[PDB]
Amino acid sequence: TRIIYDRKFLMECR
Amino acid sequence: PEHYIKHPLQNRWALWFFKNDKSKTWQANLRLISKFDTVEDFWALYNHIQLSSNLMPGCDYSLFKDGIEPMWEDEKNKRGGRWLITLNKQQRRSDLDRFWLETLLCLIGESFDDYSDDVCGAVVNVRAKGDKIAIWTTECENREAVTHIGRVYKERLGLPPKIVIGYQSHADTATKSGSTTKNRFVV
């Protein structure tokens, strides 16, 4: 499908 | 697997920098910083570079999908336009960096569903007379795409209903017979 990342996830990888 | 693989992005992205040095060419002045295609490589780049609020006036960052130059006459931008966020001097301090990070996250995270494919990139302009953030999209006449992108972006920035942001076509901006550029859409 498409690779979608919500805000919370993208923050947890920093 | 989740213990060691990088988290790929839907798209590969390129971060560009521009210094409006009037004593050099806009070709010698524009600059590819770096390209990335994972979440971890995004963060390593972002952490290594100045916050927009700390750049000298006249500078831009631009994040564009790989293969799209951060210039409106690019094949993928020429028929498009941009959702423009204008900021006053006090918002440089309160909102610029937070709004720019949120913008980056909407791009890399594909936050506009089907319509994330219409996104070309984003630009932040640091300027004495007022900072600007914009999401550039491919086609002004894709009304559903442009509208959905605008509605989600506004909500992600947390702007209240009383604030109106405009979408301006690049061609309109380049050829406006007056001071202000007219909108194609507002949200």
Short mmCIF file of C-alpha atoms in Angstrom, two decimals:
data_model
loop_
_atom_site.label_atom_id
_atom_site.label_comp_id
_atom_site.label_asym_id
_atom_site.label_seq_id
_atom_site.Cartn_x
_atom_site.Cartn_y
_atom_site.Cartn_z
CA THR A 1 0.00 0.00 0.00
CA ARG A 2 1.51 3.38 1.06
CA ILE A 3 4.10 3.99 3.88
CA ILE A 4 2.38 6.44 6.27
CA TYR A 5 3.89 7.59 9.60
CA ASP A 6 1.82 9.58 12.10
CA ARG A 7 3.41 12.38 14.17
CA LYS A 8 3.77 10.36 17.42
CA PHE A 9 5.79 7.59 15.70
CA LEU A 10 8.12 9.97 13.82
CA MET A 11 8.84 11.72 17.16
CA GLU A 12 9.61 8.40 18.96
CA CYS A 13 12.43 7.69 16.38
CA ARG A 14 14.29 10.94 17.42
CA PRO B 1 13.88 -6.95 12.56
CA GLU B 2 12.44 -3.88 14.31
CA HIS B 3 15.58 -4.07 16.50
CA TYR B 4 17.95 -3.19 13.55
CA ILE B 5 16.22 -2.11 10.29
CA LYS B 6 15.84 1.52 9.37
CA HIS B 7 12.25 2.69 8.83
CA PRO B 8 11.93 3.48 5.13
CA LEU B 9 10.04 6.47 3.85
CA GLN B 10 7.51 6.27 1.01
CA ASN B 11 9.65 8.82 -0.84
CA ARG B 12 13.26 9.80 -1.12
CA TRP B 13 13.74 13.49 -0.21
CA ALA B 14 16.40 16.15 -0.86
CA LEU B 15 17.16 19.04 1.52
CA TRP B 16 18.35 22.23 -0.19
CA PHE B 17 19.79 25.51 1.14
CA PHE B 18 19.77 28.97 -0.46
CA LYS B 19 21.67 32.17 0.64
CA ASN B 20 20.33 35.27 -1.20
CA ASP B 21 23.87 36.66 -1.68
CA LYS B 22 23.20 39.38 -4.30
CA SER B 23 26.95 39.35 -5.20
CA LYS B 24 26.78 35.76 -6.60
CA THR B 25 24.59 33.73 -9.05
CA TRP B 26 21.32 32.03 -7.87
CA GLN B 27 22.99 28.87 -9.26
CA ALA B 28 26.16 29.24 -7.10
CA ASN B 29 23.82 30.23 -4.19
CA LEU B 30 21.43 27.21 -4.27
CA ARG B 31 22.80 24.08 -2.63
CA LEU B 32 21.89 20.43 -2.11
CA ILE B 33 22.60 19.64 1.52
CA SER B 34 21.64 15.99 1.50
CA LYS B 35 19.22 13.28 0.45
CA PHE B 36 17.55 10.69 2.70
CA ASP B 37 14.94 7.91 2.53
CA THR B 38 14.55 6.65 6.10
CA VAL B 39 13.15 8.14 9.29
CA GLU B 40 16.52 7.76 11.13
CA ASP B 41 18.45 9.52 8.29
CA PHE B 42 15.88 12.32 8.39
CA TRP B 43 16.59 12.86 12.11
CA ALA B 44 20.39 12.67 11.70
CA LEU B 45 20.18 15.46 9.10
CA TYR B 46 17.71 17.63 11.08
CA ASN B 47 19.77 17.39 14.32
CA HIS B 48 23.01 18.39 12.49
CA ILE B 49 21.58 21.64 10.98
CA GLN B 50 20.53 25.10 12.16
CA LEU B 51 16.97 25.77 13.15
CA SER B 52 15.36 28.10 10.62
CA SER B 53 14.98 30.75 13.32
CA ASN B 54 18.80 30.88 13.56
CA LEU B 55 19.53 31.37 9.81
CA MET B 56 20.52 34.78 8.52
CA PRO B 57 17.77 36.81 6.81
CA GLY B 58 17.55 35.97 3.08
CA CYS B 59 18.11 32.22 3.56
CA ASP B 60 15.81 29.24 2.63
CA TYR B 61 15.53 25.58 3.42
CA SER B 62 13.60 23.51 0.88
CA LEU B 63 12.64 19.83 1.21
CA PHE B 64 11.59 18.35 -2.15
CA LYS B 65 10.92 14.84 -3.43
CA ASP B 66 13.99 13.45 -5.20
CA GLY B 67 13.96 14.54 -8.87
CA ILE B 68 12.09 17.84 -8.24
CA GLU B 69 14.22 20.97 -8.14
CA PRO B 70 13.06 23.50 -5.52
CA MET B 71 12.18 25.97 -8.32
CA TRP B 72 8.68 26.66 -9.61
CA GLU B 73 9.61 26.22 -13.30
CA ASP B 74 10.57 22.56 -12.70
CA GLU B 75 8.27 20.31 -14.80
CA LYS B 76 6.60 19.06 -11.56
CA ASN B 77 6.00 22.58 -10.10
CA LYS B 78 5.21 24.72 -13.19
CA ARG B 79 1.45 23.98 -13.16
CA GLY B 80 1.28 23.93 -9.38
CA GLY B 81 1.14 26.31 -6.48
CA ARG B 82 1.61 26.54 -2.74
CA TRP B 83 -0.26 26.69 0.55
CA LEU B 84 1.36 29.75 2.13
CA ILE B 85 1.82 30.42 5.88
CA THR B 86 3.01 33.97 6.51
CA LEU B 87 4.52 34.80 9.91
CA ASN B 88 5.31 38.12 11.60
CA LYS B 89 8.56 38.81 13.46
CA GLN B 90 7.24 37.63 16.84
CA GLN B 91 6.14 34.28 15.33
CA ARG B 92 9.80 33.73 14.26
CA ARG B 93 10.32 33.09 17.96
CA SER B 94 7.04 31.32 18.82
CA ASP B 95 5.98 29.35 15.73
CA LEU B 96 8.56 29.21 12.92
CA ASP B 97 10.62 26.19 14.03
CA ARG B 98 7.62 24.21 15.30
CA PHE B 99 5.60 24.92 12.13
CA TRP B 100 8.60 24.01 9.90
CA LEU B 101 9.22 20.71 11.75
CA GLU B 102 5.48 19.87 11.46
CA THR B 103 5.66 20.64 7.74
CA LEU B 104 8.67 18.32 7.27
CA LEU B 105 6.81 15.58 9.19
CA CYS B 106 3.67 15.93 7.00
CA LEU B 107 5.83 15.47 3.89
CA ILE B 108 8.01 12.58 5.03
CA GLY B 109 5.09 10.92 6.86
CA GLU B 110 2.75 11.15 3.80
CA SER B 111 0.08 12.82 5.98
CA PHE B 112 -2.37 13.66 3.16
CA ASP B 113 -3.52 10.11 2.21
CA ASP B 114 -3.91 9.52 -1.60
CA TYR B 115 -3.19 13.17 -2.12
CA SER B 116 0.35 13.12 -0.68
CA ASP B 117 1.36 12.19 -4.28
CA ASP B 118 0.42 15.78 -5.32
CA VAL B 119 3.00 17.24 -2.84
CA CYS B 120 6.27 18.34 -4.45
CA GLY B 121 7.98 19.86 -1.48
CA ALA B 122 8.12 22.56 1.12
CA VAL B 123 10.01 25.82 1.58
CA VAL B 124 10.85 28.02 4.53
CA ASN B 125 11.94 31.58 3.79
CA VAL B 126 13.77 33.51 6.55
CA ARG B 127 13.24 37.23 5.81
CA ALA B 128 13.58 40.60 7.58
CA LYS B 129 10.06 41.61 6.36
CA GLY B 130 8.39 38.31 7.50
CA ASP B 131 9.04 34.56 7.44
CA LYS B 132 7.13 32.19 5.19
CA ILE B 133 6.42 28.48 5.17
CA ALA B 134 4.74 26.77 2.19
CA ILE B 135 3.82 23.35 0.88
CA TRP B 136 4.20 23.25 -2.90
CA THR B 137 1.93 20.90 -4.90
CA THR B 138 1.98 19.73 -8.55
CA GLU B 139 -1.33 20.86 -10.09
CA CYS B 140 -3.53 23.89 -9.20
CA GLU B 141 -6.47 22.31 -11.01
CA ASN B 142 -6.50 19.20 -8.78
CA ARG B 143 -9.13 20.75 -6.55
CA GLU B 144 -9.79 17.78 -4.26
CA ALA B 145 -6.05 17.16 -3.73
CA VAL B 146 -5.19 20.81 -3.06
CA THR B 147 -8.20 21.19 -0.71
CA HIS B 148 -7.49 18.01 1.30
CA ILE B 149 -3.79 18.91 1.67
CA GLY B 150 -4.81 22.38 2.89
CA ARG B 151 -7.40 21.13 5.41
CA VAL B 152 -5.04 18.52 6.94
CA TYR B 153 -2.05 20.91 7.03
CA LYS B 154 -4.03 23.63 8.76
CA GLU B 155 -5.20 21.11 11.41
CA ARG B 156 -1.67 19.74 11.89
CA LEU B 157 -0.33 23.29 12.50
CA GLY B 158 -3.14 23.89 15.01
CA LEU B 159 -4.26 27.11 13.33
CA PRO B 160 -7.66 28.26 14.60
CA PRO B 161 -10.71 28.53 12.30
CA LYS B 162 -10.46 32.38 12.25
CA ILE B 163 -7.05 32.24 10.49
CA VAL B 164 -7.33 31.93 6.69
CA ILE B 165 -4.41 30.55 4.70
CA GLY B 166 -4.29 30.91 0.91
CA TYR B 167 -3.19 28.68 -1.94
CA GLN B 168 -1.47 30.63 -4.73
CA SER B 169 -0.56 29.33 -8.14
CA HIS B 170 3.12 29.83 -9.09
CA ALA B 171 2.21 31.21 -12.53
CA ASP B 172 -0.17 33.72 -10.88
CA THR B 173 2.61 34.77 -8.49
CA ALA B 174 5.14 35.15 -11.34
CA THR B 175 2.76 37.25 -13.46
CA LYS B 176 0.57 39.22 -10.96
CA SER B 177 -0.35 42.74 -12.15
CA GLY B 178 -0.29 44.29 -8.64
CA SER B 179 1.10 43.92 -5.08
CA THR B 180 -0.80 40.88 -3.64
CA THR B 181 -1.22 37.42 -5.31
CA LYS B 182 -4.83 36.21 -5.57
CA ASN B 183 -5.80 32.79 -4.13
CA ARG B 184 -7.09 29.72 -5.99
CA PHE B 185 -8.24 28.15 -2.67
CA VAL B 186 -8.39 29.18 0.98
CA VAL B 187 -8.66 27.11 4.19
#
